């Protein structure tokens, strides 16, 4: 029904997505591993959904991520540490929200800083990428 | 001789050897240059009646070697492009350090643990390069 | 084995051997079929490390012959496609009548006076067909 | 990994797919509602997967289809009657097979004639369609 | 006046009003004709600052009417294109039988149960037609 | 400046152009061998310009065409005979007109029937062809 | 409401108002952004039922003025893009200095001697921008 | 017959052509205003043909260019001054050569430095440009 188009403008989602990528996203109920466009502070961001309503989200001392004890499907070539000004973990994911992580985990301004994003702040699932340079 | 020459090719990627830059199922476009390619270009190339993709890591006159800690050296310096893997030789490849011949390109899989690239074949002659991948379309598995 | 497979190719035509259907400088698009081609398709194909274009005049099991008046016969009947030229064998081609082998296509230049087509090479194996020309873009010389 | 390309050459799958459509299919484990290319008698066909190993497949007097009593997700603007030279129904779907139906149900030479197709005869799932005429 | 004119547009379909020919999420290409469109063309058109798609069911001078059994008549005959739905007027549309004006096209949703088409708006002037949908790309929901 | 787009709908210009071809034409002063869109009787046609203001146009008994005695640059695989209800030849081409011929010369409803076309009836030069079937 | 939304448009340029960046007869592609455009983008836009092209010289909140020597100032500084012409106001345009409104873009012809751009119309609301020209194909007149 | 493809890698031909442009060129007899790819010192360059065999090429004190007294068709927003290590002007263009100028005339390493280019060093006429960024 509703489709958006944007140019990715950070490397928060690298290497899955890079600055300058073109994306198409549509407004959806999301699923773990969906990559979504969302808004915080009148600013569009992209991130991947690591957890949904009810899950608990914990860290290991060795930079690892746990959703309900067990670590995630998706792997990234980074260690995941908490943000110091973020909610306490372990962290329970509220109804109507989704816990969102940057694939490039060294950028810690995702749900680890904001908490889970409410639905009304999620603009849609990215269904198509067109990369036209920097292959 | 020639009836027709390529300007572009539109292909689907069959392998994860260029992962994570490229994934199986990705659509790509390449364009064919009549002059030279460049370092870091991802190219489509042919070896053994077999189409392959890889990234140009060195060109004519360059010297390629490895450190004991799985690092790649081009002319004694480490390359621009970084990949989340270590690079080791193919035991049945040519000798290193390896002087890249005139008119050839030394091509590496971004997914370095697959070693069927120039580590096994040596550098590829230009005439076996089909073109440079300039564009990518991914629809699933983002 | 394969890194990548063609879905389309976008090419420029270098020859007038397919004239007047195709002219030098024409841009074309082809698509690659995994199954079989058909009679009257114009295809891009390779023989002797050389890309060529031509039109499929017969397929596996067909019989190709010539009349003394420069006419082509496929299975004893004249073909659908008409060209403003006569068709004669290549003196150094195979024998006719010619039984088209399994898994091959008998390909002819629309500009029949150029005889470096299946009249010289025999029928082409399918694996040497790159794809079917579906689209044409002409900008000059209309 | 392995991709095929073909031109649909019947209207067995109409309106979902029409003769002259171009498709891309890849070799997969299939799911109900997948549309797949398959071979019978050295001939490529396309059809949609209505049932999998273990299911039972039954007809109603009123041209309706039942998979395990309950009728299917996918609806088509045709009634589904059995083929007279086909297996008996109700019909239990063997392991390693998939029961395949034409969307255009008046063409009855699908699994209703052949039975369920074994995997080795399924060439792949159609993932992309390009229709270039007859829109 | 004009800086630029459309030759093609590449669009995504937002509605199921043209279902099953077209579905939400489909990609389409249209081309813009300078002359006339034809019956059965699916076109992109604008009404109320709003882009819409539909299929041309009648043209200038034609007469459109309905039977009591939900059938469409064009010039007293039923149309070529068949859809798996019945066609009824929009209670707030113009009168029928309806004489199609000069320079207009009478456009219908293939999914006839949605009646916001020419049954409500009347026939659309040509200058509000953006072009004809010639190509379709579907990737999900096949 | 002004561009038109049309679908060729005859084979008058075959093989150069075929029914179903897409063309782009722009409004120009034309030159011999230009292929142009023109109007006669509220109907768009296409043809190639064989002669301009001042030229004389004559036929040979052997189906040949003469512009000022000498035959044309462009050759076609047809013989060119006059139309019986057309102007007398030899035929002098008026100022402000262009003598237009069908490449497929067996269709004789070009300038051989109409005479030379005035400029105001020539809609433009075809600069681009896109053939999408029947190659 | 919407049946379909643009992702790309492929257009031909009818004017030399964007010369020498763009020329009459150029083919272009644009893509439609759902978010904001940027300064220096060349965009297709509509004003008075009329498609136009131009280059975004300023955005919301910016201040546009002219020097007596035919120079353009954006926020008191001269802009990045240089054109081989001088810029003067349109005598019947709005007042300058000109505060660019919220949700609008101040658009200028690269060929500045044609003044039917934001110098006459003011800044264009975003909803009247069709998209950004990203690609150019020139075949004649190079 | 023979087509080349290259990426323009200077702004010598700006604004007509810019670094990063893609071009198509074919091997030809050239004409004034043709833009051509040519080689000097095992290096591909592009330039526009200002004069041919027999012409004379002169400069005015006011940065202007004369071909046979009369200045050129093509205008550029630059003044044209000689190169100090180039041939003497006025300069007569030898048979079998073409006098080539950079559109961006402040780059003086064109025929003003090299003299006219022989044919065997001209690789072809640029017939198509594709600009994909920096519009
Ligand atoms: C096949 C080859 C595809 C050719 C497309 C070329 C246009 C690409 C282009 O350069 O646009 C660029 C990508 O933006 C985008 O293209 C944004 C849109 C991306 C959405 C992808 C959706 C694909 C459309 C599918 C419908 C197709 C239906 C066909 C029937 C951006 O250019 P820039 O210079 O401003 O970049 C600045 C930051 N990168
Ligand atoms: C955007 C507009 C798309 C333009 C494509 C135009 C080519 C279409 C064309 O006519 O080919 C036709 C469709 O076959 C096919 O095209 C077969 C291939 C279909 C597979 C679709 C996969 C899309 C490729 C995705 C990769 C893109 C990556 C870009 C970076 C068949 O022509 P005919 O005359 O023989 O027909 C005979 C029966 N219809
Ligand atoms: C590369 C491959 C090109 C893909 C184009 C595919 C669209 C072709 C398509 O089928 O449209 C068909 C041709 O009409 C036409 O396409 C009419 C327009 C032809 C004008 C050609 C001008 C080319 C545009 C150049 C600008 C490019 C700038 C890029 C930056 C007609 O379809 P149908 O089913 O109604 O046919 C009924 C009669 N044949
Ligand atoms: C319509 C939209 C056209 C889509 C084409 C998109 C591909 C463009 C692409 O990015 O390739 C870029 C241009 O090179 C080139 O594209 C080089 C080739 C240019 C020759 C143009 C000839 C056009 C072909 C005509 C035949 C068509 C026939 C159709 C039946 C270079 O990419 P990069 O990142 O390496 O750039 C590094 C320096 N810019």
Author numbering:
A (entry chain B), D (entry chain B), F (entry chain B), H (entry chain B): 37 to 64, 67 to 173
B (entry chain A), C (entry chain A), E (entry chain A), G (entry chain A): 32 to 173
What does the primary publication say about this deposited structure?
The shaft is assembled by covalent polymerisation of successive BP molecules, while the minor pilin AP1 (Cpa) is the adhesin at the tip of the pilus and the basal pilin AP2 covalently links the pilus to the cell wall peptidoglycan. In FCT types 2, 3 and 4, another gene, sipA, is clustered with the pilin and sortase genes, in a strictly conserved order (cpa, sipA, fctA, srtC, fctB) and its gene product SipA has been shown for several FCT3 strains to be essential for pilus polymerisation. SipA falls into this category of 'inactive' peptidases. We show that it has no peptidase activity, but that it is essential for polymerisation of pilin subunits in FCT2 pili, and that its function is likely to be conserved in all strains of S. pyogenes that carry a SipA homologue.
Here we describe the crystal structure of a SipA molecule that comprises the complete extracellular portion of the protein. SipA comprises two all-β domains that appear to be typical of the S26 signal peptidase family and is highly similar to E. coli SPaseI. In the present structure the 3-stranded sheet comprising strands β1, β2 and β10 is fully formed and presents an outer face populated with exposed hydrophobic residues (Tyr37, Phe39, Val41, Ile43, Leu60, Tyr62 Leu168 and Val170). The present structure shows that although SipA shares the SPase-I fold, the catalytic serine and lysine residues characteristic of active signal peptidases are missing, as was earlier suggested by sequence alignments. Although SipA lacks the catalytic residues of SPase-I, it retains the peptide-binding cleft found in E. coli SPase-I. Examination of the packing reveals that SipA forms an octamer whose basic unit is a dimer formed by molecules A and B, the asymmetric unit of the crystal. Two such dimers then associate through interaction of the N-terminal strand of molecule A with the equivalent strand of a neighbouring dimer related by crystal symmetry. This tetramer forms a horseshoe structure, with two such tetramers associating, again by crystal symmetry, to form the octamer. The electron density is indicative of phospholipids, with a phosphate head-group and two lipid acyl chains, which we have modelled as phosphatidylethanolamine (PE). Four phospholipid molecules, presumed to originate from the E. coli host strain during purification, pack together at the interface between the tetramers. An intriguing feature of the SipA crystal structure is that the peptide-binding cleft of molecule A binds the N-terminal peptide of a symmetry-related molecule within the SipA octamer.
